[PDB]
Short mmCIF file of C-alpha atoms and ligand atoms in Angstrom, two decimals:
data_model
loop_
_atom_site.label_atom_id
_atom_site.label_comp_id
_atom_site.label_asym_id
_atom_site.label_seq_id
_atom_site.Cartn_x
_atom_site.Cartn_y
_atom_site.Cartn_z
CA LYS L 1 61.57 -53.73 -29.72
CA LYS L 2 58.33 -52.55 -31.31
CA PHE L 3 55.54 -54.90 -30.59
CA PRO L 4 53.67 -56.53 -33.56
CA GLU L 5 51.48 -54.42 -35.71
CA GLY L 6 47.95 -54.68 -34.29
CA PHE L 7 49.14 -55.69 -30.75
CA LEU L 8 46.14 -55.23 -28.42
CA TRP L 9 47.04 -52.67 -25.62
CA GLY L 10 44.40 -52.52 -22.98
CA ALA L 11 43.34 -52.08 -19.47
CA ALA L 12 41.08 -54.20 -17.18
CA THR L 13 38.28 -53.89 -14.52
CA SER L 14 35.67 -56.15 -13.06
CA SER L 15 31.88 -55.41 -12.49
CA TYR L 16 31.78 -55.68 -8.63
CA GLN L 17 35.08 -53.76 -8.29
CA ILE L 18 33.76 -50.69 -10.14
CA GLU L 19 30.03 -50.48 -11.00
CA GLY L 20 28.20 -49.60 -7.88
CA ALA L 21 24.40 -49.18 -8.37
CA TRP L 22 24.33 -52.54 -6.40
CA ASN L 23 20.47 -52.53 -6.02
CA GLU L 24 19.38 -50.48 -8.97
CA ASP L 25 17.51 -51.38 -12.27
CA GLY L 26 16.25 -54.74 -10.69
CA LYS L 27 19.85 -56.01 -10.10
CA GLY L 28 19.77 -59.02 -7.82
CA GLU L 29 21.89 -59.58 -4.87
CA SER L 30 25.37 -61.19 -5.40
CA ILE L 31 27.48 -63.20 -2.98
CA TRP L 32 29.72 -60.26 -2.87
CA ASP L 33 26.74 -57.89 -1.83
CA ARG L 34 26.07 -60.28 1.00
CA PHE L 35 29.76 -60.91 1.91
CA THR L 36 30.35 -56.98 2.30
CA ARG L 37 27.48 -56.83 4.78
CA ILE L 38 29.36 -59.04 7.12
CA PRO L 39 31.20 -57.20 9.86
CA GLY L 40 34.98 -57.84 9.92
CA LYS L 41 35.31 -59.35 6.45
CA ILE L 42 36.43 -56.16 4.70
CA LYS L 43 39.02 -53.65 5.72
CA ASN L 44 37.43 -50.35 6.91
CA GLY L 45 34.03 -51.95 6.52
CA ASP L 46 34.02 -51.03 2.82
CA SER L 47 31.83 -52.44 0.11
CA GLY L 48 31.04 -52.24 -3.60
CA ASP L 49 27.80 -50.49 -3.00
CA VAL L 50 29.05 -47.44 -4.88
CA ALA L 51 32.68 -48.23 -5.85
CA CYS L 52 33.66 -46.06 -8.90
CA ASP L 53 29.94 -45.45 -9.76
CA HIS L 54 30.74 -46.85 -13.29
CA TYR L 55 27.25 -47.98 -13.92
CA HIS L 56 26.26 -44.35 -14.02
CA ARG L 57 29.59 -42.82 -15.09
CA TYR L 58 30.59 -45.35 -17.84
CA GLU L 59 30.44 -42.57 -20.53
CA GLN L 60 33.24 -40.56 -18.67
CA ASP L 61 35.22 -43.73 -18.34
CA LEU L 62 34.85 -44.48 -22.05
CA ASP L 63 36.25 -41.15 -22.93
CA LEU L 64 39.24 -41.78 -20.45
CA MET L 65 39.85 -45.03 -22.32
CA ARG L 66 39.86 -42.94 -25.58
CA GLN L 67 42.28 -40.42 -24.10
CA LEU L 68 44.74 -43.19 -23.39
CA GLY L 69 44.41 -44.69 -26.90
CA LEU L 70 43.44 -48.11 -25.62
CA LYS L 71 43.04 -50.68 -28.35
CA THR L 72 40.99 -52.88 -26.08
CA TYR L 73 39.21 -52.90 -22.79
CA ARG L 74 38.43 -55.92 -20.51
CA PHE L 75 35.42 -55.67 -18.30
CA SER L 76 33.35 -58.21 -16.49
CA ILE L 77 29.59 -58.79 -16.67
CA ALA L 78 27.43 -58.74 -13.49
CA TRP L 79 25.55 -61.99 -13.64
CA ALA L 80 23.07 -60.67 -11.04
CA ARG L 81 22.15 -57.76 -13.33
CA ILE L 82 21.21 -60.20 -16.01
CA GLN L 83 19.54 -62.87 -13.87
CA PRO L 84 18.49 -61.22 -10.58
CA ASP L 85 16.60 -64.09 -9.20
CA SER L 86 15.79 -67.84 -9.28
CA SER L 87 12.99 -67.36 -12.03
CA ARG L 88 16.16 -67.28 -14.49
CA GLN L 89 14.33 -64.58 -16.24
CA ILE L 90 16.49 -62.04 -18.09
CA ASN L 91 16.64 -58.51 -16.72
CA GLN L 92 16.48 -56.19 -19.77
CA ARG L 93 17.77 -53.17 -18.00
CA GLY L 94 20.89 -55.04 -16.83
CA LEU L 95 21.36 -56.31 -20.37
CA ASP L 96 20.96 -52.94 -21.87
CA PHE L 97 23.66 -51.49 -19.83
CA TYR L 98 26.22 -53.90 -21.22
CA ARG L 99 24.71 -53.33 -24.76
CA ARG L 100 25.40 -49.53 -24.25
CA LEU L 101 28.92 -50.04 -22.89
CA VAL L 102 29.84 -52.31 -25.94
CA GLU L 103 28.19 -49.87 -28.34
CA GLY L 104 30.36 -47.03 -26.72
CA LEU L 105 33.53 -49.17 -26.93
CA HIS L 106 33.02 -49.68 -30.70
CA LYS L 107 32.24 -46.08 -31.29
CA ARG L 108 35.67 -45.27 -29.83
CA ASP L 109 37.43 -47.99 -31.86
CA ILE L 110 38.04 -50.06 -28.60
CA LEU L 111 37.75 -53.75 -28.89
CA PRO L 112 35.68 -55.34 -26.16
CA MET L 113 36.93 -58.37 -24.06
CA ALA L 114 34.08 -59.60 -21.72
CA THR L 115 34.70 -61.72 -18.52
CA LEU L 116 31.54 -63.64 -17.93
CA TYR L 117 32.38 -64.54 -14.31
CA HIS L 118 34.43 -62.35 -12.16
CA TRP L 119 33.41 -63.62 -8.79
CA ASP L 120 30.05 -61.94 -8.30
CA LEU L 121 27.93 -64.96 -8.29
CA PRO L 122 24.08 -64.28 -8.10
CA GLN L 123 22.93 -65.14 -4.56
CA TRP L 124 20.22 -67.18 -6.21
CA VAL L 125 22.78 -69.49 -7.70
CA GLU L 126 24.40 -69.80 -4.23
CA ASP L 127 20.98 -70.76 -2.79
CA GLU L 128 20.96 -73.58 -5.37
CA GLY L 129 24.41 -74.83 -4.18
CA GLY L 130 26.79 -72.39 -5.88
CA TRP L 131 29.97 -73.97 -7.20
CA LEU L 132 29.43 -77.02 -4.99
CA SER L 133 26.54 -78.07 -7.11
CA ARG L 134 27.13 -79.52 -10.42
CA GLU L 135 23.94 -77.89 -11.70
CA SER L 136 25.68 -74.51 -11.38
CA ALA L 137 27.67 -75.37 -14.60
CA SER L 138 24.37 -75.61 -16.41
CA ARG L 139 23.20 -72.34 -15.01
CA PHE L 140 26.42 -70.76 -16.14
CA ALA L 141 26.02 -72.13 -19.51
CA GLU L 142 22.49 -70.75 -19.78
CA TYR L 143 23.73 -67.30 -18.70
CA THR L 144 26.59 -67.56 -21.33
CA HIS L 145 24.05 -68.63 -23.96
CA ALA L 146 21.92 -65.51 -23.22
CA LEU L 147 24.99 -63.11 -23.29
CA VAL L 148 26.59 -64.59 -26.41
CA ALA L 149 23.11 -64.58 -28.19
CA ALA L 150 22.75 -60.86 -27.19
CA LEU L 151 26.06 -59.64 -27.80
CA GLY L 152 28.34 -62.27 -29.52
CA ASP L 153 28.79 -60.38 -32.82
CA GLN L 154 29.80 -57.31 -30.85
CA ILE L 155 32.28 -58.76 -28.34
CA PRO L 156 35.24 -60.22 -30.28
CA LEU L 157 36.85 -61.70 -27.12
CA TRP L 158 35.09 -63.53 -24.24
CA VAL L 159 36.55 -65.06 -21.13
CA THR L 160 34.47 -67.58 -19.18
CA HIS L 161 36.14 -67.51 -15.80
CA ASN L 162 38.49 -65.21 -14.11
CA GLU L 163 41.13 -66.89 -11.71
CA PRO L 164 39.16 -69.99 -10.77
CA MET L 165 41.99 -70.97 -8.35
CA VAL L 166 41.29 -67.82 -6.35
CA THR L 167 37.54 -68.86 -6.09
CA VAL L 168 38.67 -72.18 -4.87
CA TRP L 169 41.28 -71.02 -2.24
CA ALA L 170 39.95 -67.69 -1.04
CA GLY L 171 36.22 -68.72 -1.45
CA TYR L 172 36.26 -72.37 -0.15
CA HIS L 173 39.70 -73.17 1.62
CA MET L 174 40.38 -69.85 3.49
CA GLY L 175 36.89 -68.23 3.75
CA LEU L 176 38.56 -64.84 2.93
CA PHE L 177 36.41 -64.09 -0.17
CA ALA L 178 32.75 -64.79 -0.88
CA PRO L 179 30.99 -67.18 -0.23
CA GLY L 180 33.33 -67.50 2.78
CA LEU L 181 33.60 -71.33 3.25
CA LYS L 182 36.55 -72.66 5.19
CA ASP L 183 36.77 -76.31 4.29
CA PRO L 184 39.96 -77.35 2.18
CA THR L 185 38.30 -80.67 1.42
CA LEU L 186 35.80 -78.93 -0.86
CA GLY L 187 38.45 -77.41 -3.20
CA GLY L 188 38.54 -80.35 -5.89
CA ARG L 189 34.77 -80.51 -6.17
CA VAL L 190 34.64 -76.70 -6.73
CA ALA L 191 37.47 -76.85 -9.12
CA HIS L 192 35.78 -79.45 -11.19
CA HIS L 193 32.39 -77.62 -11.39
CA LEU L 194 34.31 -74.42 -12.26
CA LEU L 195 36.02 -76.33 -15.09
CA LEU L 196 32.75 -78.08 -16.10
CA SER L 197 30.98 -74.57 -16.25
CA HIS L 198 33.70 -73.29 -18.55
CA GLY L 199 33.31 -76.43 -20.80
CA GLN L 200 29.60 -76.01 -20.98
CA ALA L 201 29.85 -72.30 -21.57
CA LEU L 202 32.30 -72.97 -24.47
CA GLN L 203 29.85 -75.46 -25.93
CA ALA L 204 27.18 -72.76 -25.86
CA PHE L 205 29.57 -70.29 -27.45
CA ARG L 206 30.46 -72.76 -30.25
CA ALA L 207 26.81 -73.52 -30.90
CA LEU L 208 26.12 -69.86 -31.45
CA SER L 209 29.30 -69.44 -33.30
CA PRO L 210 29.24 -65.59 -33.38
CA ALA L 211 30.85 -63.90 -36.31
CA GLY L 212 34.48 -62.80 -35.61
CA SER L 213 34.34 -63.80 -31.98
CA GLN L 214 36.69 -65.94 -29.87
CA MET L 215 36.50 -67.52 -26.37
CA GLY L 216 38.91 -68.44 -23.70
CA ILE L 217 39.53 -68.46 -19.90
CA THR L 218 41.61 -66.38 -17.62
CA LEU L 219 43.97 -68.08 -15.08
CA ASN L 220 46.14 -66.66 -12.44
CA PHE L 221 49.74 -67.92 -11.84
CA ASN L 222 52.60 -67.21 -9.56
CA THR L 223 55.95 -68.38 -11.10
CA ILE L 224 57.57 -70.71 -8.65
CA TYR L 225 61.26 -70.56 -7.62
CA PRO L 226 63.00 -72.77 -5.02
CA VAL L 227 64.90 -70.86 -2.27
CA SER L 228 67.94 -72.85 -2.80
CA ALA L 229 69.62 -75.33 -5.30
CA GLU L 230 68.95 -78.25 -2.69
CA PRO L 231 67.00 -81.20 -4.18
CA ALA L 232 64.35 -81.17 -1.40
CA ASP L 233 63.71 -77.44 -2.30
CA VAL L 234 63.63 -78.31 -6.07
CA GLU L 235 61.11 -81.07 -5.41
CA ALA L 236 58.88 -78.87 -3.25
CA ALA L 237 59.04 -76.13 -6.00
CA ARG L 238 58.02 -78.76 -8.62
CA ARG L 239 55.05 -79.99 -6.56
CA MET L 240 54.03 -76.26 -5.87
CA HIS L 241 54.26 -75.50 -9.52
CA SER L 242 52.08 -78.49 -10.56
CA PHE L 243 49.34 -77.34 -8.04
CA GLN L 244 49.52 -73.63 -7.97
CA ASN L 245 50.08 -73.16 -11.78
CA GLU L 246 48.71 -76.29 -13.56
CA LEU L 247 45.76 -77.39 -11.54
CA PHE L 248 43.44 -75.72 -14.23
CA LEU L 249 45.78 -75.88 -17.23
CA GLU L 250 46.37 -79.54 -17.07
CA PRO L 251 42.62 -80.62 -17.45
CA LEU L 252 41.95 -77.64 -19.79
CA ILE L 253 44.73 -78.69 -22.36
CA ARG L 254 45.44 -82.45 -21.50
CA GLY L 255 41.89 -83.62 -20.23
CA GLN L 256 43.19 -85.04 -17.08
CA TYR L 257 43.91 -83.71 -13.48
CA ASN L 258 47.67 -83.78 -12.55
CA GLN L 259 49.04 -85.90 -9.64
CA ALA L 260 49.39 -83.02 -7.13
CA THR L 261 45.76 -82.12 -7.68
CA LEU L 262 44.61 -85.76 -7.09
CA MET L 263 46.68 -86.06 -4.01
CA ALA L 264 45.50 -82.68 -2.63
CA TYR L 265 42.01 -83.79 -3.45
CA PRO L 266 41.76 -87.48 -3.21
CA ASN L 267 38.00 -87.57 -3.64
CA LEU L 268 38.01 -85.47 -6.87
CA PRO L 269 37.26 -88.48 -9.07
CA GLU L 270 33.87 -88.92 -7.32
CA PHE L 271 32.67 -85.65 -9.19
CA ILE L 272 33.89 -86.66 -12.72
CA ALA L 273 31.06 -87.89 -14.99
CA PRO L 274 31.95 -89.92 -18.12
CA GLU L 275 31.95 -86.95 -20.55
CA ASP L 276 33.32 -84.39 -18.34
CA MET L 277 37.11 -84.21 -19.18
CA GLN L 278 36.22 -84.27 -22.94
CA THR L 279 33.88 -81.32 -22.36
CA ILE L 280 36.42 -79.52 -20.13
CA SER L 281 39.26 -79.88 -22.60
CA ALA L 282 37.52 -78.83 -25.82
CA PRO L 283 39.75 -76.30 -27.59
CA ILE L 284 39.88 -72.70 -26.36
CA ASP L 285 40.68 -69.98 -28.81
CA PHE L 286 43.10 -68.27 -26.35
CA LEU L 287 44.50 -68.36 -22.86
CA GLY L 288 44.20 -65.23 -20.37
CA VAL L 289 47.15 -64.92 -18.28
CA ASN L 290 47.02 -62.88 -14.81
CA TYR L 291 50.41 -62.34 -13.17
CA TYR L 292 51.62 -60.07 -10.43
CA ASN L 293 54.29 -61.84 -8.48
CA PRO L 294 56.32 -65.05 -8.11
CA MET L 295 56.21 -67.29 -4.95
CA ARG L 296 59.45 -68.61 -3.42
CA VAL L 297 59.31 -72.06 -2.02
CA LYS L 298 61.33 -74.41 0.29
CA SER L 299 60.86 -77.88 1.53
CA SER L 300 59.54 -78.55 4.99
CA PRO L 301 59.38 -81.62 7.18
CA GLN L 302 55.81 -80.88 8.27
CA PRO L 303 52.68 -81.52 5.92
CA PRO L 304 52.20 -80.75 3.23
CA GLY L 305 56.06 -80.57 2.94
CA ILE L 306 56.09 -77.24 1.32
CA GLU L 307 56.65 -73.68 2.87
CA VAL L 308 56.13 -70.45 1.09
CA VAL L 309 58.95 -68.10 1.92
CA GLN L 310 57.82 -64.33 2.27
CA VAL L 311 59.96 -61.56 0.72
CA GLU L 312 60.63 -58.31 2.34
CA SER L 313 61.70 -56.25 -0.73
CA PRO L 314 61.03 -55.27 -3.45
CA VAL L 315 57.31 -55.48 -2.86
CA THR L 316 54.21 -53.43 -3.75
CA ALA L 317 51.69 -52.14 -1.21
CA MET L 318 50.11 -55.65 -1.17
CA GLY L 319 53.43 -56.99 0.01
CA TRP L 320 53.73 -58.84 -3.46
CA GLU L 321 57.20 -59.27 -4.78
CA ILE L 322 58.21 -57.32 -7.85
CA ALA L 323 59.96 -59.70 -10.20
CA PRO L 324 59.32 -58.99 -13.96
CA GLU L 325 61.53 -62.07 -14.92
CA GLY L 326 58.71 -63.98 -13.26
CA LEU L 327 56.26 -63.00 -16.16
CA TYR L 328 58.86 -63.99 -18.79
CA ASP L 329 59.48 -67.35 -17.20
CA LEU L 330 55.75 -68.02 -16.72
CA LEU L 331 54.93 -67.33 -20.37
CA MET L 332 57.79 -69.48 -21.71
CA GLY L 333 56.89 -72.28 -19.40
CA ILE L 334 53.36 -72.34 -20.45
CA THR L 335 54.35 -72.31 -24.13
CA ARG L 336 56.97 -75.02 -23.77
CA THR L 337 54.57 -77.20 -21.66
CA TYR L 338 51.30 -76.79 -23.33
CA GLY L 339 52.29 -75.41 -26.91
CA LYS L 340 52.30 -72.05 -28.58
CA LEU L 341 48.61 -71.17 -28.09
CA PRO L 342 47.33 -67.46 -28.32
CA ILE L 343 47.96 -65.67 -24.95
CA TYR L 344 46.64 -62.32 -23.80
CA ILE L 345 48.01 -61.02 -20.52
CA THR L 346 44.63 -60.21 -19.01
CA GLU L 347 45.92 -58.65 -15.85
CA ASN L 348 49.39 -57.29 -14.79
CA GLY L 349 49.91 -54.23 -12.49
CA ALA L 350 50.67 -53.00 -8.91
CA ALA L 351 49.19 -51.27 -5.92
CA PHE L 352 51.10 -48.33 -4.45
CA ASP L 353 50.08 -45.62 -1.90
CA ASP L 354 49.20 -42.91 -4.40
CA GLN L 355 48.41 -39.34 -3.25
CA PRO L 356 47.60 -36.25 -5.19
CA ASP L 357 50.21 -33.51 -4.95
CA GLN L 358 49.38 -29.95 -4.13
CA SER L 359 48.69 -29.21 -7.68
CA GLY L 360 46.35 -32.19 -8.08
CA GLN L 361 48.58 -34.52 -10.00
CA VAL L 362 49.18 -38.12 -9.09
CA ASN L 363 52.71 -39.09 -9.75
CA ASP L 364 53.48 -42.77 -9.37
CA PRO L 365 57.00 -43.54 -10.61
CA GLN L 366 57.02 -46.93 -8.72
CA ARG L 367 54.10 -48.08 -10.87
CA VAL L 368 55.79 -46.83 -14.09
CA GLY L 369 58.86 -48.91 -12.95
CA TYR L 370 56.57 -51.96 -12.44
CA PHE L 371 55.02 -51.56 -15.92
CA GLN L 372 58.38 -50.78 -17.55
CA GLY L 373 59.93 -54.12 -16.16
CA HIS L 374 57.05 -56.24 -16.91
CA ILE L 375 56.15 -54.94 -20.44
CA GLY L 376 59.75 -55.41 -21.22
CA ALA L 377 59.66 -59.00 -20.00
CA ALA L 378 56.44 -59.68 -22.01
CA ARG L 379 58.29 -58.26 -25.02
CA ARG L 380 61.25 -60.76 -24.59
CA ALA L 381 58.67 -63.59 -24.32
CA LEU L 382 57.21 -62.66 -27.62
CA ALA L 383 60.69 -62.54 -29.13
CA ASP L 384 61.45 -65.95 -27.80
CA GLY L 385 58.36 -67.45 -29.33
CA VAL L 386 55.31 -66.85 -27.21
CA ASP L 387 52.16 -66.09 -29.10
CA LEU L 388 51.37 -62.91 -27.02
CA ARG L 389 48.41 -61.03 -28.62
CA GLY L 390 47.71 -58.42 -26.12
CA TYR L 391 48.50 -56.98 -22.65
CA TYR L 392 45.82 -55.61 -20.18
CA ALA L 393 46.90 -53.26 -17.38
CA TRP L 394 45.03 -54.01 -14.08
CA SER L 395 43.47 -51.66 -13.51
CA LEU L 396 42.05 -48.75 -15.54
CA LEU L 397 40.61 -47.33 -12.32
CA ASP L 398 41.40 -47.42 -8.63
CA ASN L 399 38.60 -49.76 -7.35
CA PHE L 400 37.33 -51.99 -4.58
CA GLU L 401 40.17 -54.45 -4.00
CA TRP L 402 38.11 -57.13 -2.40
CA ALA L 403 38.99 -57.83 1.35
CA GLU L 404 41.34 -54.89 1.33
CA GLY L 405 38.41 -52.65 0.24
CA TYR L 406 39.68 -49.07 -0.90
CA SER L 407 43.03 -49.44 1.14
CA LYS L 408 44.63 -50.38 -2.10
CA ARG L 409 44.98 -48.55 -5.41
CA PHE L 410 45.86 -50.51 -8.59
CA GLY L 411 44.54 -47.90 -10.98
CA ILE L 412 46.57 -46.13 -13.72
CA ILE L 413 43.64 -43.60 -13.18
CA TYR L 414 43.21 -42.10 -9.61
CA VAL L 415 39.69 -42.11 -8.31
CA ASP L 416 38.65 -39.74 -5.45
CA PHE L 417 35.97 -41.89 -3.93
CA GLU L 418 34.42 -38.93 -2.13
CA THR L 419 33.76 -36.99 -5.35
CA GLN L 420 34.23 -39.58 -8.13
CA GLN L 421 36.79 -37.30 -9.82
CA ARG L 422 39.25 -39.32 -12.03
CA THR L 423 42.74 -38.09 -12.70
CA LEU L 424 45.18 -39.72 -15.01
CA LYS L 425 48.30 -40.99 -12.95
CA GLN L 426 51.80 -40.51 -14.42
CA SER L 427 51.55 -44.27 -15.23
CA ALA L 428 48.42 -43.60 -17.43
CA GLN L 429 50.33 -40.93 -19.32
CA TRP L 430 53.35 -43.13 -19.65
CA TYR L 431 51.15 -46.07 -20.83
CA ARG L 432 49.46 -43.76 -23.48
CA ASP L 433 52.96 -43.15 -24.86
CA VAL L 434 53.85 -46.93 -24.88
CA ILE L 435 50.66 -47.62 -27.02
CA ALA L 436 51.48 -44.68 -29.38
CA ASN L 437 55.01 -45.96 -29.76
CA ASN L 438 53.87 -49.62 -29.85
CA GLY L 439 56.47 -50.56 -27.41
CA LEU L 440 58.84 -49.01 -24.72
CA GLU L 441 61.18 -46.11 -24.77
NA1 NA Q 1 27.83 -53.44 -8.17
NA1 NA Q 2 31.92 -53.72 9.21
NA1 NA Q 3 37.72 -54.91 11.29
NA1 NA Q 4 29.92 -49.25 1.90
NA1 NA Q 5 41.95 -43.32 -29.07
NA1 NA Q 6 28.81 -48.35 -31.83
NA1 NA Q 7 30.27 -47.74 -33.97
NA1 NA Q 8 16.70 -68.14 -4.46
NA1 NA Q 9 26.74 -81.79 -7.18
NA1 NA Q 10 23.01 -74.96 -8.85
NA1 NA Q 11 19.22 -69.84 -16.61
NA1 NA Q 12 28.52 -76.99 -28.99
NA1 NA Q 13 27.23 -76.97 -31.71
NA1 NA Q 14 64.80 -85.02 -1.18
NA1 NA Q 15 47.71 -71.34 -3.02
NA1 NA Q 16 36.14 -82.39 -27.30
NA1 NA Q 17 50.47 -55.36 -6.02
NA1 NA Q 18 51.61 -56.48 -8.12
NA1 NA Q 19 54.03 -47.01 -1.96
NA1 NA Q 20 41.73 -58.88 -0.70
NA1 NA Q 21 39.92 -50.14 3.24
NA1 NA Q 22 34.25 -45.51 -1.59
#
């Protein structure tokens, strides 16, 4: 039950969630800086203004990574640090930060994986239409070109987008995340431009062809199970799977949108230029998979004919069902449907109500249990033919959990946000052992 020699064990973060220094060194405002200033949008009125203060404390966090024996570390790049404003001019201080981070990773034999876009769009791009505008795909490609030119040979794994489905749903359907639009009819248009931006970014990457470097995209999924064996429930589950799990995968791999997508978005074809599917479906080097929980579905008489059924137990602090078999099923399904392409699990983890004990230790056995089940499921998938290349725990650090603010702790390392003190949780200690053993037990 050892994983393959060279298997990439990592942990993941994102820029807005950990960096702080929101207005330092010429950094421009992002849509998340703006969103968190809006009263009522975030629990406890929290923001990423300071977060984990990682922009200043990155060397401490690098040593924590080393202490755990991480083989790889997934971070995102704050686009607004790099292009603060509409002049499109490169901010050298912002770029230098990522240069220093990447140098530090290599110094400690940790392989960098960089996410170009983890939701912190520069406000200047939003002022030019954001993801509603086709031109934002070109802006994203110019940003990618700059970063890959600067750091390509030093970052062996690049991800264009993180969870474009969440950007669509939370950002444009529900208004729960930045930029806070609440118009379901916009989802197709946004999805197409996210996909187009990925494609143009990938073209920029191929043009530069950095030595030893690869590029992919990270998607989130919720494995779908029908609540019963009834045909109507099976049908609802199939439709929900197509939409929830294959909206992006289908165009990425097959160069077409699926029927569930076109029905949900019936004006989508109006945004597709003659090239656009070819560009979107150009080969990626790997797929990033983010998974936390399944969704359970039943048929309904009322539109859209699908109801998601909530689960009371077993759940995390987010109310998300704990079902490690969901991860196995997801990985097998992707592999069977789209072929045996390289996969990294770019996020998997859990939020629990962690509290230091009287001695100052943070013991999180529920999180250990979550990782035990899920890493076990990933191992079974690998045994059964999935080309799993790495696993990244979400998250290295407790951090700013978007609209939940600091009420939710996903870290394997506990952060006291009053003092910025970091403490390895029991789960970090356990994970260090897994890495050293190259597997469970
Ligand atoms: Na920040
Ligand atoms: Na507030
Ligand atoms: Na409130
Ligand atoms: Na704040
Ligand atoms: Na180490
Ligand atoms: Na170095
Ligand atoms: Na070095
Ligand atoms: Na502007
Ligand atoms: Na447009
Ligand atoms: Na634009
Ligand atoms: Na530009
Ligand atoms: Na190219
Ligand atoms: Na080229
Ligand atoms: Na039926
Ligand atoms: Na959804
Ligand atoms: Na092509
Ligand atoms: Na969770
Ligand atoms: Na979870
Ligand atoms: Na708990
Ligand atoms: Na949230
Ligand atoms: Na909070
Ligand atoms: Na805080």
